[PDB]
Design a protein around this ligand. Structure first.
Ligand SMILES: *[C@@H]1O[C@H](CO)[C@@H](O[C@@H]2O[C@H](CO)[C@@H](O)[C@H](O)[C@H]2NC(C)=O)[C@H](O)[C@H]1NC(C)=O
Ligand SMILES: *[C@@H]1O[C@H](CO)[C@@H](O[C@@H]2O[C@H](CO)[C@@H](O)[C@H](O)[C@H]2NC(C)=O)[C@H](O)[C@H]1NC(C)=O
Lengths: 23, 23
């Protein structure tokens, strides 16, 4: 519904931090 | 690069909570 949106990736500070530790 | 800064420790609400549970 928006005009002019572009693709990208938004970095999530929690995901790698809590995936490296939990393993 | 700052004048007047002082030492201290900033408490992180996530670290102890996710370290006690994950163990
Ligand atoms: C990146 O942006 C493009 C267009 O801005 C998207 O391309 C279309 O996306 C829809 C929905 O996913 C598809 O139905 C179309 O077939 C796509 N067209 C083309 C030419 O690719 C695209 O989805 C966006 N994301 C990625 C990962 O490419
Ligand atoms: C606490 O603050 C003091 C000064 O405000 C810091 O002391 C200097 O720190 C630098 C970099 O760590 C060192 O190269 C100097 O040798 C230190 N000087 C002295 C007299 O200690 C100190 O680093 C800060 N942090 C701690 C944990 O003390």
């Amino acid at each position: 519904v928006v005009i002019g949106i572009v693709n990208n990736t938004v970095y999530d500070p929690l995901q790698p931090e809590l995936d490296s530790f939990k393993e």
